[PDB]
Design a protein around this nucleic acid. Structure first.
Lengths: 49, 254, 324, 322
RNA sequence: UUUAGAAGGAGAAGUCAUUUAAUAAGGCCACUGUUAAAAAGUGUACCGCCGGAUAGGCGG
């Protein structure tokens, strides 16, 4: 959660991640040649949970 | 009495570097939030100024991890100490996605308001020691200077917005356009530039501060490029400033 | 005041940087230094790990190719030098987020009462004591001829220490340099000072062409599974997390201290990785003390106050139990 | 206590550095030394390996291009000089991790008892014996005229050794210098001192422009193929973990010792590559012996105590799955 | 008011035995370095006296 300067006042944000976009990006980067990272910092149990 | 203040060679360690689908340069919203926090810290003090427009000049970078023999990057994370909630008493803790980066960069702030002089630089120097940049920790700095000429900017590569290259590519959805535009030009990199809106303004049970307006957001991604300081066109065409619309909190150049 | 706020968080007031390793000679340690680099290596071992008595009969005589990395001093430099720095910020101006307001006022009042009563001097003296004995040498420390530590604040070069003549189980309170450094740290802790900067440099006479021990990275890869050491700007170094864990090893007020007689790092439940059991799994934990201090007003003993403020300096997310 | 803790590991107590190779002349041994570098060399074999008779007829007369490296002495020096060092640390202050206190106290008590009876003297004598007979030369020991080993402690230069007289099968404990050094090593092992720093310099006379044999790099099937040699600070050298294997050849207490009658390096299962058979594949292994010594709390013969202390000196990862 | 706030990856190790790179050869022709200059900057600081103070002060 962050604070954004809307006008002269402030708004509170509740940032959420888009996992379907992440999966699509993973597929497209799999079938591509752009430099990329794997980021295997996860386990099967955690991903299940 | 408008002017420009340059913070020279600021070193940041363990800065956050993991957006949803981006690893590397942190989001521009982090730098703008740092500038806003600096302005708020000064305004809470006796010196009253205002900051509009920030320019970033990269000098060095280093991702936290190592490089494979195949050329890929493998990122490292600190050992998770303890996590609140369930299973908070066991020695070993769960590991989520994270990345970190060290970077040494210079900042250019377009500051406006009364009493813009060397006293303002001294105040910013005194009050900048209790701040963080994108979750990182400031360690050292070269100096703070008052700059009105473009020729005084040291050597470095600025970061601008190149959404035209994104919009000038084939493909129906802009993911294909972004991928194709990245294939044409190796300089272009994807960066996060703001947040969209996924709900309506309201109040919920449990938040950082139950007085402001709550709104669930998403991460907004675009393209960007690196331009040398010696071949920069103009001072004004390198700044990053806020932009507010109907749930379209964003950072741009203008 | 019925319970803890739904969103309360703190930040660490003791921020350390990444250490960097240099090698030099003892007689010229004040003049020159040389870089220390990390070298890859490969080993060929034998399968000696504990195997089931079925697989053992099949692969007892099998070779074991493995990869590793190592750091080693050169053949003409016999002194290891480690430089780093600390930044100190006030505890009161570190509560980044607090949803409630009465709880914030109560926390400020209790912090002010603790400042008026003690003055944050015990914890400051303990931290400087941990600095002086060079506990930050988790492995290299062992087998050292001479250990020398030097502390500088901004320009004043305080006299050097001798970490060999310091027990790692007892704390010293009678030392002029320790007294003034801890007094300045306590001044920055209470709120009299906006910030404090400290620079630490340690020389170790580990021997000629011996082995030094940098920090080890935590990486995951399908093909490689070897040992990877921390490289900092092309030189060997130590993580800031590892150094910070040594500094906050001040907890001597945990239950059953008379059965163990060694300090442990301060944590929410008193857990330490070295021992494998939590020393505060009960009403001596941080949460129970902070409930017996703020929610129901009660003058806790001085040791529990020390532990609570030591937790607060460490920082964390001490919020309420979140619910759906 | 009933079982080993879920996390248990011992750091090593004998830290050997990495050898560096120099070349010199025997008459000017204490005067000068010269660097010994490594030279590339490509080779052309004639396909001498064993092949099936299908492709043997068609692929026998072909050449074979490979690459490799080599290290030989110069044409003016006939002596090879090897310098390295050892650091000795107490055995008790070596348990890196242990997720139990009862096990730690039991191990400390057992080590105190072993110090009470023996005092870590036999193992110290055997280690100095393995230093004296120059078992660490490996293939450089073959076909040598004079081997002279010198051990220096602090500033006391101990009298030189004649390494060829010692036999690689029996251990001598009657030497004055060997016992004098082993006393300090045992004192460091027990805990009377904090650390010991030994320095070893070996002179081997093999002949003019002969060949020396440094350690060979282990290469996986990723980069390339070909022989690569170990270069320490430019000059050739030996791996630190290869010298430690030679000084670890003290185990003469395994079963069926009378059948073979030679020492073997201290291993968990008693594996010996020089003969290819395992000497401790059963209840005489370290895992079986340490359980009866600590958990069951029973007395053991002093040979098994010697073997257990030798394993503890080397160190390892003695963890236990739940 | 910063995808905010938090963090010990650690212990153990034998890479190795062999080797035939080898035969033959035409680097060739042609060419404008040019004009102008201050090594002087004091060129080297000596005989003596009051100083009993290696304090500090006079004469040619």
């Amino acid at each position: 959660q962050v604070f954004f300067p809307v006008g002269g006042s402030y708004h509170l944000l509740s940032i959420l991640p888009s996992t379907v976009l992440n999966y699509e990006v993973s597929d497209r980067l799999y079938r591509s040649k752009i430099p990329k990272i794997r980021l295997r910092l996860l386990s099967s149990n955690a991903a299940s949970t | 009495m408008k002017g420009y203040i340059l913070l020279e060679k600021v070193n940041i360690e363990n800065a956050n570097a993991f957006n949803n689908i981006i690893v590397g340069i942190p989001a521009i919203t982090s730098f703008l939030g740092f500038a806003r926090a600096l302005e708020r810290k000064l305004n809470a003090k006796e010196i009253a100024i205002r900051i509009n427009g920030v320019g970033l000049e990269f000098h060095e970078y280093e991702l936290k991890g190592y490089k494979n023999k195949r050329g890929q990057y493998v990122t490292s994370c600190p050992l998770p100490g303890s996590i609140p909630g369930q299973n908070e008493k066991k020695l070993d803790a769960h590991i989520m996605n994270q990345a970190y980066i060290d970077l040494n960069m210079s900042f250019l702030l377009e500051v406006e308001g009364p009493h813009v002089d060397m006293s303002t630089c001294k105040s910013i120097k005194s009050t900048m020691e209790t701040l963080r940049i994108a979750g990182g920790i400031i360690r050292n700095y070269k100096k703070i200077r008052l700059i009105d000429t473009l020729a005084d900017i040291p050597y470095g590569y600025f970061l601008t917005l190149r959404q035209d290259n994104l919009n000038d590519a084939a493909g129906d959805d802009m993911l294909d356009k972004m991928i194709h535009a990245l294939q044409q030009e190796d300089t272009l990199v994807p960066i996060a530039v703001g947040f969209k809106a996924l709900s309506e303004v309201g109040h919920v049970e449990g938040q950082r501060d139950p007085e402001k307006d709550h709104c669930f957001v998403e991460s907004i991604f675009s393209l960007g490029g690196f331009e040398c300081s010696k071949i920069l066109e103009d001072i004004n065409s390198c700044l990053w400033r806020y932009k507010t619309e109907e749930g379209l909190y964003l950072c741009t150049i203008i | 005041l019925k319970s803890r706020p739904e969103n309360l968080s703190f930040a660490r007031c003791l921020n350390t940087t990444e250490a960097k390793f240099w090698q030099t000679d003892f007689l010229k340690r004040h003049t020159f230094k040389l870089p220390l680099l990390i070298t890859d290596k490969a080993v060929l071992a034998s399968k000696g790990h504990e195997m089931p008595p079925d697989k053992l009969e099949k692969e007892i005589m099998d070779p074991n190719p493995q990869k590793s990395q190592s750091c080693t001093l050169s053949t003409e430099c016999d002194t290891l030098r480690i430089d780093f720095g600390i930044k100190v910020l006030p505890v009161k101006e570190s509560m980044y987020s607090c949803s409630d307001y009465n709880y914030r006022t109560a926390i400020y009042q209790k912090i002010d009462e603790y400042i008026a009563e003690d003055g944050f001097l015990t914890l400051a003296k303990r931290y400087v004591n941990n600095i002086a004995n060079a506990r930050f040498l988790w492995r290299n420390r062992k087998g050292a001829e001479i250990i020398e530590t030097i502390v500088t604040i901004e320009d004043k070069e305080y006299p050097s220490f001798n970490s060999k003549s310091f027990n790692l189980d007892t704390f010293v309170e009678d030392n002029a340099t320790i007294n003034e450094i801890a007094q300045q740290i306590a001044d920055t802790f209470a709120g009299k000072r906006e910030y404090l900067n400290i620079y630490v440099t340690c020389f170790v006479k580990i021997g000629c062409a011996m082995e030094v021990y940098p920090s080890q990275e935590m990486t995951f890869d399908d093909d490689d599974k070897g040992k990877k050491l921390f490289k900092f700007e092309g030189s060997a170094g130590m993580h800031s997390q590892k150094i910070n864990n040594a500094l906050r090893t001040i907890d001597t007020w945990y239950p059953d201290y008379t059965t163990y007689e060694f300090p442990i790092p301060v944590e929410n439940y008193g857990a330490a990785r070295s021992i494998g059991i939590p020393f505060r799994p009960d009403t001596k934990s941080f949460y129970k003390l902070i409930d017996r201090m703020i929610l129901k007003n009660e003058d806790l003993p001085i040791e529990d106050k020390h532990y609570v403020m030591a937790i607060l300096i460490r920082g964390g997310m001490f919020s309420k139990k979140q619910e759906k």
